[PDB]
Amino acid sequence: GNCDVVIGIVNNTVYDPLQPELD
Amino acid sequence: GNCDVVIGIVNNTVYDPLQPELD
Numbered sequence A, B: 001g002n003c004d005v006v007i008g009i010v011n012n013t014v015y016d017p018l019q020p021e022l023d
């Protein structure tokens, strides 16, 4: 989904640890 | 497994998110 439908929402960054792994 | 063992399996491409970032 996109952040244009959900009734209650917040802003935080999903880490996806692989970026660290790649570098 | 190996592709031969399963029945009705269809040739297709599976995409990996990690490879693009690495390159």
Ligand SMILES: *[C@@H]1O[C@H](CO)[C@@H](O)[C@H](O)[C@H]1NC(C)=O
Pocket: A007, A008, A009
């Ligand atoms: C009620 O809940 C919504 C999320 O569904 C939130 O945006 C809102 O701030 C809340 N308001 C009150 C008055 O509880």
Ligand SMILES: *[C@@H]1O[C@H](CO)[C@@H](O)[C@H](O)[C@H]1NC(C)=O
Pocket: B007, B008
């Ligand atoms: C699926 O059904 C068709 C019927 O035309 C058949 O040719 C095919 O062998 C079947 N798939 C199998 C057994 O995986």
Ligand SMILES: *[C@@H]1O[C@H](CO)[C@@H](O)[C@H](O)[C@H]1NC(C)=O
Pocket: B011
């Ligand atoms: C595609 O499927 C056929 C099934 O007859 C197989 O012979 C062929 O090797 C497959 N293609 C691949 C692995 O690229």
